[PDB]
Amino acid sequence: PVTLTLYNGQHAATGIAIAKAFQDKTGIQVKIRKGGDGQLASQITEEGARSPADVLYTEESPPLIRLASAGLLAKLEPETLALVEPEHAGGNGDWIGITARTRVLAYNPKKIDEKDLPKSLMDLSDPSWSGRFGFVPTSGAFLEQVAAVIKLKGQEEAEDWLTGLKAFGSIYTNNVTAMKAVENGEVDMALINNYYWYTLKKEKGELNSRLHYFGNQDPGALVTVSGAAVLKSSKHPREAQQFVAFMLSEEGQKAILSQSAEYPMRKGMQADPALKPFAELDPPKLTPADLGEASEALSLERDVGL
């Protein structure tokens, strides 16, 4: 019996859920190697032809763009590519978006009124916000945020903004910690992806904290995609292609969305109605390809010491 190996950079329970759904549907066993996006992409790069990985599933797109550029990803079947909009797949069709998420501003309405929140992500470099907001500069999500600021506002403004965040922002090493810190009144607001609030609400029932959406094509309204790919080295090419296709089936998308409050990439599928409607987000006009590997953003983070 074939066993597929899934390198899962997405959340642990999401990889488990989709692996279970595929295994029940097809009888194909799915073994999961859990890791971070970059750790897994680096492992695949070092393992080369000996890599046991059949499918890679990542939280963010930069690792897929990196591996695609190296030629490590198999072209996806056209039937699979037809399940999503072209802007939500790799340019050469060797990786495909699975879900999308959005940056938000979580805030405690007991500590700051909605009308007094910063109008733009770019306002948070101002000294008046010192000590009032948390962020997670070591996260791949924040890396994409920086790349978006560089792309929308230019390198010099991005450097000035990130300098202000180094001066004035409260550094958290974990998104769940930052979200609970807002919920528990330790910090007034935090820059996070939307789905952390929903995970915490599911656990606690009702929350004190609320989500603010910057909208208005603000850099802080960035939408990013998680993605998946078949490894060119896979010795189970038919089965691996079947797996990625199943991730974008109605059943697979539902299994994935049962574990994270994100937006489905399968055309014609609606998200959880409790999410802010996708058409209302007014995000900046940046695609996965626009953000790329976020190499300039990484260098800027290093230069500022974040």
TrEMBL record:
GO terms for molecular function: metal ion binding. Fe(3+) binds at H11, E59, Y195, Y196. Fe cation binds at H11, E59, Y195, Y196. Keywords: Iron, Metal-binding, Signal. InterPro entries: Ferric-bd, SBP. GO terms for cellular component: extracellular space. Residues 274-306 are annotated as: Disordered. Belongs to the bacterial solute-binding protein 1 family. This is Ferric iron-binding periplasmic protein HitA. It comes from Pseudomonas aeruginosa (strain ATCC 15692 / DSM 22644 / CIP 104116 / JCM 14847 / LMG 12228 / 1C / PRS 101 / PAO1). The lineage of its organism: Bacteria, Pseudomonadati, Pseudomonadota, Gammaproteobacteria, Pseudomonadales. The gene is hitA.
